[PDB]
Amino acid sequence: TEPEKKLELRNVSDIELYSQTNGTYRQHVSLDGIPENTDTYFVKVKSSAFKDVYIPVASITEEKRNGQSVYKITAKAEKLQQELENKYVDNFTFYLDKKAKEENTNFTSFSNLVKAINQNPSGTYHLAASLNANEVELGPDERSYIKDTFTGRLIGEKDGKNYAIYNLKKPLFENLSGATVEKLSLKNVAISGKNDIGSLANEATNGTKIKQVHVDGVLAGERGVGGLLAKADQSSIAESSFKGRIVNTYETTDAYNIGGLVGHLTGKNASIAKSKATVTISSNTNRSDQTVGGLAGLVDQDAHIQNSYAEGDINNVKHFGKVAGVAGYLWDRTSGEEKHAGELTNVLSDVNVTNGNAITGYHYTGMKVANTFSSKANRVFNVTLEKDEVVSKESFEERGTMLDASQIVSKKAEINPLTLPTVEPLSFSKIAHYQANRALVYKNIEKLLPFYNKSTIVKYGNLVKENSLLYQKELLSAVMMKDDQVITDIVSNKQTANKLLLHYNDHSSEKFDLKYQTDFANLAEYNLGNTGLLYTPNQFLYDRDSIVKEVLPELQKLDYQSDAIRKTLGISPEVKLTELYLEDQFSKTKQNLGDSLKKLLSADAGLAADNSVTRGYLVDKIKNNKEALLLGLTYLERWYNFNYGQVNVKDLVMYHPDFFGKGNTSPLDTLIELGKSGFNNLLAKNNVDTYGISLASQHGATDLFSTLEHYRKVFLPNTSNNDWFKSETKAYIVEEKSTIEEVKTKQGLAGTKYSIGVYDRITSATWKYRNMVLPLLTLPERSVFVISTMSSLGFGAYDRYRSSDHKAGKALNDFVEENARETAKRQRDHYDYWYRILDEQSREKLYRTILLYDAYKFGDDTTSGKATAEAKFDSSNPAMKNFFGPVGNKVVHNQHGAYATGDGVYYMSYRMLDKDGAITYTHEMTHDSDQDIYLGGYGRRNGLGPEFFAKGLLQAPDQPSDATITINSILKHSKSDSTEGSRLQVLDPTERFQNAADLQNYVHNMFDLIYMMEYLEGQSIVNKLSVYQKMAALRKIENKYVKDPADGNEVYATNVVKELTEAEARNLNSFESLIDHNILSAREYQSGDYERNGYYTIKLFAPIYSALSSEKGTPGDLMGRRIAYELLAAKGFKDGMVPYISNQYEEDAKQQGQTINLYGKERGLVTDELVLKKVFDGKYKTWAEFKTAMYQERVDQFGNLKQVTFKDPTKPWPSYGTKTINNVDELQALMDQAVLKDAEGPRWSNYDPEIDSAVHKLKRAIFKAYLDQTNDFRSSI
C-alpha cells in the first residue's frame, strides 16, 4: 500500500493573512468582517521547522465553530495536503479567531502597550510577561515609541516576578514628569539616535522615582548619550543597573554630557543611590566642554552620588574634554560653591579609564568629593607634548585588589529576568508505515524532503541503510556545484548540480552525488547516489524574472553619498561616511546586483502562487527597504568573503541561514534588519559585535568566532584553525617560536595564554582589538605584515617602508618580508633571554599579548625618506583602506618618539623593522610590563617612575660602541661586520646568558674590570693632580628633596651634581675620602642638576666613587641606576637588583614604622637603610662600607691574578700593535700619564669630552682588549 506523494505543511507554527486592497500589503490579523467579495488575499504560513510559505487564498467563508463568527479560509495550491483531525484534506483550510480583548490595558504585548499608554498616560500599568518590542514599526523619524510627556506613572512589575522589554531600538518614554517606573528591565537595547538618547527616557523634568531599573544593551549617540536618562532634572534614581556598550565616537563638536547611567544631573534633590554601571564606554571628546563620566557626568546643583559602583572601561581618544571614571564635571556653570557643585559619598570606580581621571575630571581646592575609592587599574594620560609621552593621572583614592571586600558599597547586584516567548518547534508517529528505531532517521530525512507528505517521508526513511551515515543527527544540507554553494535554483536546476554536502550534528560534512533525475516543474527533485534517497531544494522555482525586471531598475539608481542612504542610517549631515569603509564594495555590489538579488529571491521564501499577489508582496518588501537592503548586501559581502579551501562563505553566510539549523529565519529579513540597524551597527569597527546582534541568534550560532570554528569543522577538516587562518589571509604572517624546548612545546598547542598562532591570540578574550580578524581575512594584497612572536603581536603596513630607495613593487615586498623575519627573530631572542633569566616562576606570565602598531605615516615612492605625513583616515593607501581604518584605533601619531600606552606599544618615529626598532622595542616593553613581569611580581618602587627602569636599566644599548652599562639582550652582531672596532658589548645574546647565574657572573666580571679601572683612576686623582685641576676634574653629587604633584610627601630625592668647593677639593687626599665626600668624574656627567624620571644613563668608563645613600625613600636617578648595577654585581638579579627597585621589602617597612601617605592611604616606605639591612644584614652597615668593601675585594683580586694578555693601542691613525700590559703597575702608570695629559691643556669646548679625552681612550682600549681576550666576560683574574 504505497502512498501518493503530495505537498504537505507539517510544523505549521502560525498562520497570517495579508491583503492587497489599497496597493499596499498589511496584516488582516483580526476582524475580517463579512467574507470579502474579491479574493486577492494571500496566506503566509510561518513554520518553526522551515521557512515561511506564501500561498494564495481560494475561499473565505463563515462557519460556526461553536455558534460564533469564526471565518474558515481555504487556500489554493497545486497538491497541498493538510492533515486535519487525523485525516487528510486536499486543501489547506484554517480558522481565524474574531478578536482578543487585551487592548483595554497594556499588560500583554508591546504593540498593545504603545496603544494603551497613548490613551491615558497617567495611571498604573503592569507587565504581564516578557514582551518583545519588535512588533512596533519603529517609525521613519519617530523619537520614541511613547510620545506623551509624563508616562508610566506607576509602571511597576510586582504582579509577577520581573518582566523585561526585549529588543529596544529607540527611547522608551521620551519624557518623564513625576512618573515612577520601578522593577522594569531592558535586556537587549540597541538605541541609536541623532539627538540626546536615553534607554528609559530622554528627560526627567519633575520628581521621577526611578527604582530597580536594570538596562542592558548597546547605546550609540551623537548629540548626547545617557545610560538611563539623558537628563535628570529634580529626579532620583535608586538601586538601578546598567551593563552595555556606549559609543559616541562621532566627530560632533557640541556640548554633550555622555554618561553611563545618566547624562546630566541638574536637580537639587536629584540623587543616585546604590547604583551600578558596567559601561565599556568609548567616546571622542574633541572639545573641553565635553564630559564623559561613566556614572552620571557633569553633576550639578547639589546632586549627591551615594554608594555607586563603576566597573566598565573608558576609552577616550584625546583628553580634550573632562573625562573621568565615576563623575564628570562636578563644577557648575554658575557660582563655584563647594556645596552648589555636587557631592560624592562612598563611591567606588575600578574602571580602566584612559586619557582621564579615575574619579573626577576637574579637581579644585574646595573639593566636595568626600569619600571616594578606586583600585589599581590603567589610568593612562597621553600628554602628547613634543615627543608623545604617557603618564598616570594620579587624582583618585587608591585601594588594593580587595574590591570584593569593598564591594559592599552597593549590595544590590541583579535580578533573574524572565525569558521571552519560547515558541518551540513542537515536533510522524502512527503513520502508514512506521518503525521505532528509525524515528530520528525520519527527522534526518525531513530536512532532505521539505514540503512533502509524511507518508513519503517514512517511505524514503525505510530505504535508508545502517551502513550509511544518516543515523546521526543532521542539520540542513547545502547543494553545491564543484565547491560553489549554488543558491539560484531555477538557473542551476536543469544543470545537474554535482554535490550535496550534508552537515551532521557531529560537525561532519558528507558529500553525496546529485543528478536531476525526477523532474517536476512545481518542485525540483534529485537522487542521492546508489541509496536512491530523494533530495529536493527548498524552493518552488517560481518566476523570479517578474520580480527582477521590476525591482532591479529602482535599486540600480542609488548613490553612496545620497540623502536616502544617510536617512536610512542614523547619520546627521555633518558627520561623514568614511568610517563605514564600504564605498568600493557598495559600487561593486551595485554593478553585479542581478546575481545577488536572484540568489536572495531564491533563498527567501517558497512561493507556491502563480497569482501576482505574492510576487507583488516580494516586490514591495524589496522596494520599500531598498536602501537598507543594499546596505546590508554591501556590508555582508564586504566583510564575509573568505574561502575555506575552495568554498566561499559569502554565499553560505549571507544566504543559506539554515546551515547551522534554525530554518525559520529568512535571508531577506536579516538583510533588512542589518541595513536599518543604524550607523554604529554597520560600522566597520564593530564587525565582531554586529554578528552577535544581527546575524547571530538567527543563523543558530552564538558568536562570530564560534561560527568560524564551525565552518572550519565542516569545511576543511583535520586542520588547525590557525593554519587555515594563515593560509587564507593575505597578510604576511611571521611567527617565531622560542629556542627553549619547553616553551617551544608549550606554544605549539592551541591552548589559550600559550598559543603563538595569530588566530588563537586575536580571537581570545581580554584582547582589545579582537575585531581585527574580519578585516584581516579580507586583505586583497600583501599589504600588512603580522609579526606574532611570544608575548607580542605587531601589525605593520608595507607603505610604511616605501620610499625613494624602495620601489612600490618587487623590492618593497622582499625588503619588508626579510626585515620582518629578522625583527621577529630579534624579539624572540630577547624574550628567550628574559625567560631564561626570570626563574621566580613569573616566567609563566611572559605570555601576555600586546599589539605593536606602527606610525600610520605611509610614505609615497616620491618621498626621499620615511615620510611624516600622518594620513589620518580615508587615505588612498590600500593598507589604510582595507586595514587599520576598519580596525579603527585612533592614535596620537606624532612626528617623533614612541610611547607605550600600557596595553600596547606604538611606533610613531622608529620603524619597527629597522635594527633601531628593537632598541626602542625593549624600552617600550620595559615601560609596558615592568609591574608584574620583569620585576619579581611586586610593582615599581614608589619614588622611581616608569622612565627609571627603562632608559638606563633594563634595555639593550642604543649602539654597540656606546660606553654605557647595559645588557645586549636583543641585537646579534657577528664579528664579520666592521662594528668589531669598539665592541664594548655582548657579542651574542641567548648564548652568553643561559641562566640568571650567567647574568650575575657577566655583571660581576664587568664591574670587576670597571672597579679596577676606577680604582686606578682614583689613585691617579689623589696622588698626581693639583688642586685647581682637581676642582674641574671632579664634581659633588647630593640628593635634594623637592615637592612633587602626584604625592603629597617630599621623601623622594632628586640627584644634583655641583662644582665642589676648593675647601672640599683640598681635603680630597685619600681614596676613602673620595667615596665618603660623594664625588664623581666630570668627564661625562654634566654640571647641571638632574631631574626625576629622566633619560639619564650611567656611563661605563665615567667613575662614580660616590655611594650616595639616600636615607629617605628613593635614591634618585643617576645614583639609583649606579647603585642598582653595583648591587646586581654583588647579588643576583632576583636577590639583589629586584629588592632594590621593586619595593618587595615594603611590608617590612610598614611593620618597622616607615610609612608614607600614598594617594590618601597609609603605605610602607622602602628606604635605602632597610634595603641595606635586609639584603646584607651582617656584612655592611652603611652604603659607603659596601662600596669600600667592593673596592677592597677588587684590589685584593687584581693584586694577585691579572691577565698579561692586554693589547691596547691608544695611539693615533698610525696603527699601534701591542703595549702588552703584564702587571697592574704599568697600567696604573699609564693611567697616571693619561690623567695628567687630560689635565694639561684641557679643551672643554664644543662639549663631547669623551673622544678627545685620552683617559677615555685608554679605558675603552683596555675594555675592548679584555673583552676580545676571552670569548666574553667570564673571569678577569
Author numbering: 674 to 1100, 1109 to 1958
Reproduce the article's own wording on this structure:
All classes of bacterial IgA1Ps cleave host IgA1 within the heavy-chain (HC) hinge region, the linker connecting the IgA1 constant fragment (Fc) to its antigen binding region (Fab), leaving the light chain (LC) intact while separating the Fc and Fab. The overall structure reveals that S. pneumoniae IgA1P is a multi-domain enzyme, broadly comprised of N-terminal (NTD; residues 665–1070), middle (MD; 1071–1611), and C-terminal domains (CTD; 1612–1963). The active site is formed between the MD and CTD domains that bifurcate the Zn-coordinating residues of the HEMTH motif (residues 1604–1608 in the MD) and a downstream E (E1628 in the CTD). We have determined the structure of a member of the M26 metalloprotease IgA1P subfamily of bacterial IgA1Ps both in isolation as well as in complex with its human IgA1 substrate and solved its structure with a neutralizing mAb that provides insight into blocking S. pneumoniae IgA1P activity.
